Design a protein around this ligand. Sequence first.
Ligand SMILES: Nc1ncnc2c1ncn2[C@@H]1O[C@H](COP(=O)(O)OP(=O)(O)OP(=O)(O)O)[C@@H](O)[C@H]1O
Ligand SMILES: Nc1ncnc2c1ncn2[C@@H]1O[C@H](COP(=O)(O)OP(=O)(O)O)[C@@H](O)[C@H]1O
Ligand SMILES: [Mg+2]
Ligand SMILES: [Mg+2]
Lengths: 177, 52, 52, 52, 365, 277, 281, 210, 70
Amino acid sequence: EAAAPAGPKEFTEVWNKKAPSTLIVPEFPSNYTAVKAVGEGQVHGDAFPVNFYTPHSILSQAQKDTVVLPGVDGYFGVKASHVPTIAQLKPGVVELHSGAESEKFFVSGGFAFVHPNGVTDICVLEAATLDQVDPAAVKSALAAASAAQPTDEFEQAANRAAIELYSALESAVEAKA
Amino acid sequence: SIAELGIYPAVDPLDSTSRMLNPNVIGAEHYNVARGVQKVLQDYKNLQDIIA
Amino acid sequence: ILGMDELSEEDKLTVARARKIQRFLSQPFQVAEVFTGTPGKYVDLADTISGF
Amino acid sequence: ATDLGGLQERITTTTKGSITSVQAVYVPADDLTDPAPATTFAHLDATTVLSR
Amino acid sequence: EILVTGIKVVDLLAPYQRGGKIGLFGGAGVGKTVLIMELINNVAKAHGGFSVFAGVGERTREGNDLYREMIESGVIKLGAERGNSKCTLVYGQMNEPPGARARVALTGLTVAEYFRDIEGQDVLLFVDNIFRFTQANSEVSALLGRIPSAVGYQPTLATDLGGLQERITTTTKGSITSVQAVYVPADDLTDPAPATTFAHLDATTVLSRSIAELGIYPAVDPLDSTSRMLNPNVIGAEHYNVARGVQKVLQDYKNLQDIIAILGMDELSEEDKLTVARARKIQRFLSQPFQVAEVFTGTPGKYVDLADTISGFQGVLTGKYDDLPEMAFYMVGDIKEVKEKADKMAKDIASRKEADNKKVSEELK
Amino acid sequence: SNQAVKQRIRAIKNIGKITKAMKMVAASKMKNAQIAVEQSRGLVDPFVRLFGDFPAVNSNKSVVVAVTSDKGLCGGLNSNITKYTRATLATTESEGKDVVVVSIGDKGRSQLTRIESQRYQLAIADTYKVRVTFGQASLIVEELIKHNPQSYQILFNKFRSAISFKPTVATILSPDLLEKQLEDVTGNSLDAYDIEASHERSDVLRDLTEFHLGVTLYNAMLENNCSEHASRMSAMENSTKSAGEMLGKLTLDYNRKRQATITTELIEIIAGASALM
Amino acid sequence: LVPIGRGQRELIIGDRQTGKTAVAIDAIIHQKNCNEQVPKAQRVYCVYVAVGQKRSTVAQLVKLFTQTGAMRYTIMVSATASDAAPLQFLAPYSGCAMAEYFRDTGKHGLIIYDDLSKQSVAYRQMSLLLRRPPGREAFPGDVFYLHSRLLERAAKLSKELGGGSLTAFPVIETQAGDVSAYIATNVISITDGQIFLETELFYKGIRPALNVGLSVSRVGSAAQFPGMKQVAGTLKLELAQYREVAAFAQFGSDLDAATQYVLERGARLTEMLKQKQFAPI
Amino acid sequence: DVFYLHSRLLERAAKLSKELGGGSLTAFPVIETQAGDVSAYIATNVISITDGQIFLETELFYKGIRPALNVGLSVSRVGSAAQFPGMKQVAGTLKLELAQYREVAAFAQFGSDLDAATQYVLERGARLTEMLKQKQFAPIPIERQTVAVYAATKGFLDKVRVQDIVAAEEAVISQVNPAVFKILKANGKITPALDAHLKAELRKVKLPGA
Amino acid sequence: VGLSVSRVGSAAQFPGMKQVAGTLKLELAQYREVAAFAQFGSDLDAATQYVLERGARLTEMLKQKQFAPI
Ligand SMILES: Nc1ncnc2c1ncn2[C@@H]1O[C@H](COP(=O)(O)OP(=O)(O)OP(=O)(O)O)[C@@H](O)[C@H]1O
Ligand SMILES: Nc1ncnc2c1ncn2[C@@H]1O[C@H](COP(=O)(O)OP(=O)(O)O)[C@@H](O)[C@H]1O
Ligand SMILES: [Mg+2]
Ligand SMILES: [Mg+2]
């Protein structure tokens, strides 16, 4: 079960005994990250590290005390020493509270991990916040998403993803403060 | 240099001149073609220090 | 090619000292005061060594 | 060298006074090893370059 | 018939004829006197015939050095056993007026011509700076009231040089192996005094200044030195093929010099940068420590046999030695000494010993 | 002879303008591609703390990826990771596995088939022409999972600074084919996480490994693109310097030939006049 | 590439040790090999004029021509370097007058003035000592006429005068590829063609080191063997493509598959024209 | 006869035999080149007359290295058997380490990589260069030269910062016991009894900066 | 325009031309500096492209036809 201890510690061994000596051992992405998942600490009470990520942006590196994430089984909330959870997110709004103030981003869907040291990693693709969405072209798109039922299952799945994204973007644009 | 490209007659287009290259003499629609040809070939000669 | 804030702060001080050296090498001339108004200034050597 | 030397060797400091000559130097073909500047520069003790 | 000199670049790329006219071209400190002394030390000691050194327009210090060095070697004996000497020196050095330097090569030629014609044997004629004959006639001919020729030389340059050089030949009655150093003015080979000398010589050895500035000594340009012995019907098939392969690698590297200069080494093809590496190997391997240079270098001199040169350069050409560094080839004898120097310089990067091995701290009395 | 030097001078004087121009161009591209790279650097971290970093795995099928440049005026960057991908293919291949080699950039297909021709199966290129996006990196990822391997190795040059580009190897494992097997530590290291997926853990790990491969491919070919721009800016500034030095030596030699020409024709005129007068 | 007719003047111009005397010697040895297979009205009698060479080189050539068998057709007029400058000046005219017997009796001649530069140097000496005023590179004024009145004697005669021919191969040595020198430009101007050999192609292994761009033959393909003409326009055209798509062949990375076929095809053709010496085909 | 102008002149600089007196004349002809062109006519004339050559570089002269000796070109095949035997054994190490410093800085100017052994000989050769600087009108005796070359090639001047070596080799000569230079001048040679002693007196040297 | 000098034209031209020609000859001084650089028009800074377009405007502005002085 644990019979192959791979890793950057041990790749150095098999590489140094088999690669030419003019090349030093190549780097690895674990050498560039400081924060691991099973290690000790990084909770300290109420506010835990939240890392909000898209491929094209970093939206939050700050410490938050609660996060409201839109999982595929409903909007759940992440408090400080929350249970470790790999949560697939559906289209919904992500609320990063710190107190009275909070940042509400509507995201497109993509996972959010909570780690055994309390590190929470929201990893979405497109996080289009609520004050930059228009409320007019959403109905113009879900009208065609409601109407079009093709013969193929592929565009069927695309239309189902379309309606589950646009319908959730409906519910979070009229009921905003 | 025109000749080892194989082009015959190896007349340099950007060195051959005539006093018959007035717009008054051969008309404007011939002179504009000749001036455009020389302009295009000179700009290609400028671009040859990149595209070679 | 990169920018003014690209380099360090000691490079900022090298830029500042050299820009006030480049202006301090300038001098109003006594012969040119007839067409520039401002009087010219004969600077001694003991003053420019100390000033720089 | 002998004509330039016979000119430039009369510009010295004697015991009675001195002549200090400021000479405008033209460099032919922008070539500092041409014999007129290369013979003239053997006599110069300072250069004052006025740049645009 | 070939004359094996022990010099790798000479024996490979421009082999000397035993009985032919040999020219060492180069100007002002490229090494055509150290080449002529290495040729004396290698050829003249293993010759059997007589030698004539005709010093035409050279340093008097060098002539005294050769005279004392030939007394130490027994080539010149003094006094009662003088007749067992093997060399005649004829010296017309550069302190002499231009009538003497213009005619001392003829005196040395006559001393060689007597041994060739009357004694009937094979001799060596080493003429240091045959250019000084041309120059001394050029100094005289300004005052003989003549119109000058090109660059400033006499009108009778080619015929004076020809009538001197056409006497230095092998005949049916004897042999003269002629090694003449030729100075080039301002490092210009198109000067008429070297360009006229080029036609009278069988083996040409052009020493260039930039190759000397690269540290490669003897600074023989391999792409400008030629021989009439470089012929597959004279030296063999594999020797001629190895020589042409070395010259092909060096020419292909010379054609890559501009883009290596302005774009960098990192933008050639793979076969191009294999050619560049093999050429940088065979440029260093053509250099050699001389036994007459061991007093001002510190390296022992390395006589290389001709078969050793052919075998080593065939090894570098086929690709047996793509693994060694470049400086393994610099100033070595042959293909064994490149491997010896490779382990000598790769034990050197591992050469770190403990405790500094003092045994000096308070040595007792 | 004395005219061809005047044309060589103008050629080298123009090369010293073209290379200075594209040095400034590569600098302008590097300063705005660094912005996208250090923003893309974030999303790779949750996967390398959730899935670890296991390069030396017992995959029986691998896909190596060498992320090279498209324009080939970079200065030893593309052959550096060619040396690294022939070093890592001589690190995992010791057990009789299948390896597929793909490359991103035209300098990869021209330098990978020289070292290895049979395992190379795909050439992605023209990537950096418009820009590099995540839909493009995910399309490349789907064409990588057209094969069914148990590991993926990405080779790229990571933009540490404008001077240093450390060649990073990045590894992704197939989900329960190798990822669930490499986590079994007297039990599992992944059982601490509570799966909140719509389906079971194998499906969420399949989706997670596809998303991880996409984000490391996007970050890999962003880091390599801007390190390409930095090595071009540094490689056209050692080029315009050498083209200024070559131009200086050419101008000095041309001036020597100019002076020697004027003296030569003057001496011939004087000789021809003294031969008459 | 540079086809040569009976009666034209083809310059062999090059640097030193590039293959000029080699092409001349091959041309003579091949006429020995051809004179056995043709009738007596088709034979070519060679004349080799050695101006300013050594006696050793000329003795070497005479030994070579006796071992091949070319001396039953060859005259050698040798004014070597020890000879007087008027002899080296008059030796091309002497050799051409000995070759004009074959032009004037309806037979065919092949005259090779090796080192015509050395004949110009001997003429310069002879005219500078006669106090005639020098000119460019201290040459006389009539150093063009010196060579034009010699090279114009090589002609293909009409059938009234016998139909004889004289083919001249003057040899001009240049200085580091400088064909802008005085005698080089004069003899380039006089002769019909030129066979320009290079010292950079010579060390690429390309032997005979013929620069296929600068080598011209102004008789054209009108004096070419048929069949060789059927392949020669193609060979010229692919070599012309191989020359021009080169200066990019250093970047062997990007396979283009249209230029690359042209490059390796021209490599086949360039390796084809290599040839060992003293064995004409 | 412009070659004969100088060869008639510079051949009178001789070392005579014992039968003529043993007297000597040492010449130093000076040639001014134009753009570093040592392939001029008069320059190549005298290069083929003189024994050695001291080539003074104009780009070394503006970088502060004075006397701006081009160590690669500067040759003297006549003084080798004519150097101080104490200097002959310590400056045989000096010119070879300056050769490697000339090989490293002529290729590694790009800032490509530090091999960390060629990087050692770059700031070793920078120390030998700064040790070979000299002020004007202040000649040094040959014994106070070959100790400063001993202090630098034997690593006693190592890890002194390169802008201290002008002040540091003045610290070496000032603090070493003046009886050291008296033994070295008289033997002409760093004897085995002296380098063990001179290594000791160099360890007791207050180098600047520590 | 870079090599042609007039050492009189300081206060020897039309004043309405002198109001404008200083700007015209300083805009062309930037265009001659950046022109042979950015022969390509692909990847350009928003300051260099502006003086390139201005220099290309002035260059076509100055050219005129023969035997019709203005
Ligand atoms: N096709 C060839 N194949 C092999 N070797 C050749 C070929 N052509 C010439 N060579 C060799 O190259 C050298 C060329 O010398 P060549 O006979 O050309 O003298 P040259 O150039 O006419 O006159 P000079 O000797 O004055 O330079 C000779 O050694 C010859 O053997
Ligand atoms: N074979 C050689 N090996 C090493 N250094 C050499 C060699 N030949 C010359 N040198 C160097 O170049 C100088 C010139 O040598 P020399 O043969 O006297 O040249 P030349 O006679 O052409 O002036 C020598 O003093 C030495 O410093
Ligand atoms: Mg000498
Ligand atoms: Mg010949």
